[PDB]
């Protein structure tokens, strides 16, 4: 019982292809520019709990793990798509802020409508 899970945080439930992680970041930027997003685990969690989130993006380098470890279980409970990206700094950047973001929620994709649906469908495959 070894593998990819050894090198990644325990809150990362699955491997995300590089290009797919790149699409998630682009969707965040597009949504930031033409739709509506929520930044940070606090807001992201609320959006998920309130059923507003269309997609949840979680950085893979957040420490301590408790900061976002509750997101994956909650998203699956609420049937809300979530995907991971390598850097919390980059996620912050995509979200339009100067500091890092542990997680982000896309409420209205705006022009990223189709991209978000693509991401959700692929992640759906992955989680299998």
Domains of the chain by start residue, with CATH: 1-128 (3.30.1330.30)
Q: What is the resolution of this structure in A?
A: 1.9
Please name every residue paired with 58 in a beta bridge, in sequence order, or none if there are none. 84, 103
Please give the order of strands across the beta sheet that includes 82-85: 36-39, 103-108, 55-59, 82-85
**Of residues 18, 35, 28, the one with CA closest to residue 105:** 28
Resolved by: X-ray
DSSP state string for the chain: --SGGGTS-TT--S---HHHHHHHHHHHHHHHHHSEEEESHHHHHHHHHTT--SEEEEES--SSGGGTTTHHHHHHHTT--EEEES-HHHHHHHTT-SS--SEEEEEE-GGGHHHHHHHHHHHHHHT-
Q: What is the largest CA-CA distance in the chain?
A: 44
């Amino acid at each position: 019982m070894e593998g990819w899970m050894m090198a990644k945080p325990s809150y990362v439930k699955f491997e995300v292809p590089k290009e797919l992680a790149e699409k998630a970041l682009q969707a965040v930027e597009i949504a930031r520019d033409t739709g509506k997003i929520r930044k940070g685990t606090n807001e992201t969690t609320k959006a998920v709990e309130r059923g507003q989130a269309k997609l949840v993006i979680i950085a893979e380098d957040v420490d301590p793990e408790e900061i976002v470890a509750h997101l994956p279980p909650l998203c699956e409970e609420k049937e809300i798509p979530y995907i991971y990206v390598p850097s919390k700094k980059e996620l912050g950047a995509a979200a339009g802020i100067e500091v890092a973001a542990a997680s982000v929620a896309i409420i209205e994709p705006g022009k990223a409508r189709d991209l978000v649906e693509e991401i959700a469908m692929k992640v759906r495959e992955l989680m299998k």
